[PDB]
Amino acid sequence: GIALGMIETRGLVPAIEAADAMTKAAEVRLVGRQFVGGGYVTVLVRGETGAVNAAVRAGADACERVGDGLVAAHIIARVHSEVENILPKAPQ
Amino acid sequence: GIALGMIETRGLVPAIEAADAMTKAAEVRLVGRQFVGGGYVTVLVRGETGAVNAAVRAGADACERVGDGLVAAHIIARVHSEVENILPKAPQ
Amino acid sequence: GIALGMIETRGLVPAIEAADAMTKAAEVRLVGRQFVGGGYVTVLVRGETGAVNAAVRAGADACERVGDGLVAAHIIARVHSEVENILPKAPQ
Amino acid sequence: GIALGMIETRGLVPAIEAADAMTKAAEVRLVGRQFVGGGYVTVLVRGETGAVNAAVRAGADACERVGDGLVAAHIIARVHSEVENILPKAPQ
Amino acid sequence: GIALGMIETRGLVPAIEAADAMTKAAEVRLVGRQFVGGGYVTVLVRGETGAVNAAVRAGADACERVGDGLVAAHIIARVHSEVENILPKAPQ
Amino acid sequence: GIALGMIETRGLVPAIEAADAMTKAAEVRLVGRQFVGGGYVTVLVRGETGAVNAAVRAGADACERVGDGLVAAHIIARVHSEVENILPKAPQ
Amino acid sequence: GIALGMIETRGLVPAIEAADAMTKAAEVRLVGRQFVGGGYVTVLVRGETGAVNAAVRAGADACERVGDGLVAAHIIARVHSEVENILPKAPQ
Amino acid sequence: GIALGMIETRGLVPAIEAADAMTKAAEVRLVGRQFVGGGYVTVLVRGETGAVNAAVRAGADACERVGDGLVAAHIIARVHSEVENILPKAPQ
Amino acid sequence: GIALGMIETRGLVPAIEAADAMTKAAEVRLVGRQFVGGGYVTVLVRGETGAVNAAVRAGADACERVGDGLVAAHIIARVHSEVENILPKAPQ
Amino acid sequence: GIALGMIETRGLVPAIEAADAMTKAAEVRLVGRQFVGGGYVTVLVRGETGAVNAAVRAGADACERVGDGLVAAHIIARVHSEVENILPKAPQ
Amino acid sequence: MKIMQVEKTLVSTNRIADMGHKPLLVVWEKPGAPRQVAVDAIGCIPGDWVLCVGSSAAREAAGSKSYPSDLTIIGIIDQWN
Amino acid sequence: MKIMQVEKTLVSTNRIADMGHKPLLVVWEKPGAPRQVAVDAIGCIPGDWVLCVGSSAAREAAGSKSYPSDLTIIGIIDQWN
Amino acid sequence: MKIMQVEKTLVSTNRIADMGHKPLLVVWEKPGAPRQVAVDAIGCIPGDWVLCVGSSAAREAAGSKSYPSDLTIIGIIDQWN
């Protein structure tokens, strides 16, 4: 599936918890983890729309209480072609 | 299209949402996504003036609510050659 | 020993103190230290569940009063396979 | 044309707007754009003293109401030879 | 001379003004300009103790009013050998 | 579809109404109806995540008003193998 | 393009500033400057609708503060044939 | 069509807007645009009575808001031969 | 010397005084004097940027207390090529 | 470079400081230092208009807080031929 | 109102939040006719013959003055073929 | 509601101010069918299969009681072809 | 909304007073298609490609909740053929 789930946090530890919850909740693949600068860390998963919905909801609830918390939990069902050039394909 | 559109966000999730909205709103080329440092992320598209105008308005209205929100949605219809030099040609 | 322990600190000195306390309190391998940006530094240890629990409690207790202090202390008893892709194997 | 004009902005969008206004207002070569860290972005133009004066005034006026805004606008009519070592010759 | 003069500022533009004033005031060589993260920029000069004193005083006064201002203006007459490994020798 | 949807009701009439709504709302397989004892009745459907999500929302909104009403409407997109063991395969 | 941009001012100097801003902002050709009597001066540009929009906005903001200011800044995307007989084709 | 429609405006931009509206509203011939002096501009169209009526109403409602606005929107269905003499035949 | 300086006056006497002061203060060629209608008279000089700055300041200072006075004093350091079509080359 | 910059000080120390700052700020030749009588000392520099402007501003800023202070800072962009007879060509 | 046959169900996961939890059915007038999507305010099965109201009555038929529906099933025909 | 395919985007620079900043998509029912323009309340891509509501529900679907829309995309179909 | 081409102007002298002073344009979808009349809220010329909204959005698009319009032009397409 080509649906994108994004979770942003202050700091890496809530991002790790959110990614763990996201992958445990639904059939989604962790596609990246980006340090944004300033403490922002974003975790990106790909999958089917329903799966990504469930994963992002679970990740948001899981990481809301960890560290400095959650910034954003957004869902894009279909990403434009141009946006796939700024989306990492594998996590380093 | 040599017109330029820029959107600045606090964090990367609103930047991806804004770039998605912009690229789905009109025929614009996503030519960059820069981490300014400190939390700011800027997304740059190129296209003809009407395309860029419509895309930037859609992206601003789409990413105003996401995360810590929007910082700037600016359109430059005529960009000087010198500026072009500092503008990314392709996104990485 | 596949349990994961995490500690965030505002600064590298509390991070180093927490990592030293973690490694001294229980047999946990310190698998990473990440500069998150913004001043956040995270330390990641892998080990047996009870070992990681003891180590993370000792690390949080040791680094609460060091420098700017502690941000997050989290234990995941078993992480998903997708999450191991964003977890360092060894520091540098 | 060895006068130096500088503009700081909180973010890249006001920096790009200020650079475009600077280049359009007077014949000044935009010799650099530096991400300073923390969100500060600086734009550096070289030109004749009166040209740099006009350009820096236009740039500050253009970028005051863009994004998070303007931080510094400075003109040095003649810089020391030691300072040219820390001034970029051309952007990238 | 091996005396070290340091000036720290929020942002690059006051640092540039401070370096210009420092080199115009006394016989000191600009030995580096370091982005520290968070907006901090430091400029380092080397010379004789009296020269470095005059230069750092002039730079502090010059950059106090520029942008977000001055953070620190410090003078070290003789630097330890170990500290020369963390001091840049030429400005990039 | 390995996603699971569950609806719990006080009494059997709201359970039948909820199962009717769920099976008419999406492509989901009614795989069980358990009398928990004490008055609770649970209805379990299996399907792909989007189907289960839509079906459970429709069933909850349909059976909220019926009888003594709803107790729980829960969706599990990713169900562990161990859990599958306790889940009825066919309704009796 | 056949879109018309018009700017009216009290006096010639704000009209000159508006025409300069209009042509610097977008790809529009100055097609005329008409003295209307009574102090009214109008500047007319032609181009594509998006270009003319950006140009007229920039010209309005630029000349709002000059002299006795701005009277009207209007945009016509498609002009009727009959109106091209009262529109100058080149500026004398 | 020997009916006459006239619209008077303060300034030329509302006159052009009114003439555009009139010529797009009905089958009317734009036969003149006179600078009366002092700021007034008059636009004269000819056509059959219904065409002129519809055109003048549309033009008045279109140019009421533009610039310093409307001064007069008058329809003459039957024009004396003597008057015809003073009426421009073609616009210049 | 392609910088443009403009002065509006209410009347021809302050315009002539401003033109004389402009020409005496710096080496600027007086390229035009336009009767704008309504009493506005504009004087246009071309020269080097610093020359035009000095000349326009002197002209405004000289003509503020002459006749009905001064309306506008504006400097454009570099005008667009489209604007030169509406700028006189020499007076008459 | 025929522009003239002048600075008066009450005393020779602020005059020397102002001359040094003037010469360091822009490329201006210090053509004279006159003891006026009564304690007034004047310093005269010749150069390009923008250079003289920058130099005189720097000199006034530097000598305001030196000794008894500053009396006058004046720039003449172009002096009459009669005035050159009372302007020194070089100091002694 | 129109007489329709229920083809199947339709799921749109990312549909607007104002659509609520209401189910959506793909219906046609007759097999092979152009498909439409109706809000299922009744709870019918595929093969049912149903009554569908369009225009602004479908909004209130789906539960609110503001509901985003232009086609709502409001009944099952007792006897149709 | 109708099931549509997104053809492309449409830009009208001089459109009325009451249209806001909302994007406009050219959609058809099927390739070759008459084109229509829908307000994109979802953010879909060309080739998507979408749900479109007409009548007065499209106005509120686009964000306001007063919005000038008679066709608004309100969801992307999870599975369609 | 629909994509139309402006054919010409239409004048109805004795039209109801509630129509105001707004111009009326004869438009078709394509040359030869059935004609319709739209309220010109934009000011377009014959041969233009325009966006037309129907239903109740055309009323407010023409300037009022109570305006007697069921088709209003709300924009000119920048690029169409």
Residue numbers in the entry:
A (entry chain D), B (entry chain C), C (entry chain E), D (entry chain E), E (entry chain D), F (entry chain C), ...: 6 to 97
K (entry chain A), L (entry chain A), M (entry chain A): 1 to 81
What do the authors of the reporting publication say about this deposited model?
A medium sized shell (~23 nm, T = 4) is present in both constructs in low abundance. The two T = 4 shell structures from both mini-shell constructs appear largely identical, except that the β4-α2 loop of CsoS1A from mini-shell 1 is disordered. Three different sized shells with T = 3, T = 4 and T = 9 icosahedral symmetries are built of essentially the same hexameric CsoS1A and pentameric CsoS4A, which are highly conserved across α-cyanobacteria and many proteobacteria. All the shell proteins possess the same concave-out orientation, consistent with other shell assemblies. Intriguingly, only T = 9 shells generated from mini-shell 2 contain extra densities not accounted for by CsoS1A and CsoS4A at the inner surface of the shell, which are absent in T = 4 and T = 3 shells. The angles between capsomeres in interfaces 1 and 2 vary slightly among three shells, from 30° to 35° and 30° to 43°, respectively, leading to small curvature changes in the shell assembly, thus the size differences. Despite a large deviation of the tilt angle (from 0° to 43°), the main interactions at the interface between adjacent hexamers, which is mediated by the hydrogen bond network involving Lys29, Ala30, and Arg83, remain largely conserved.
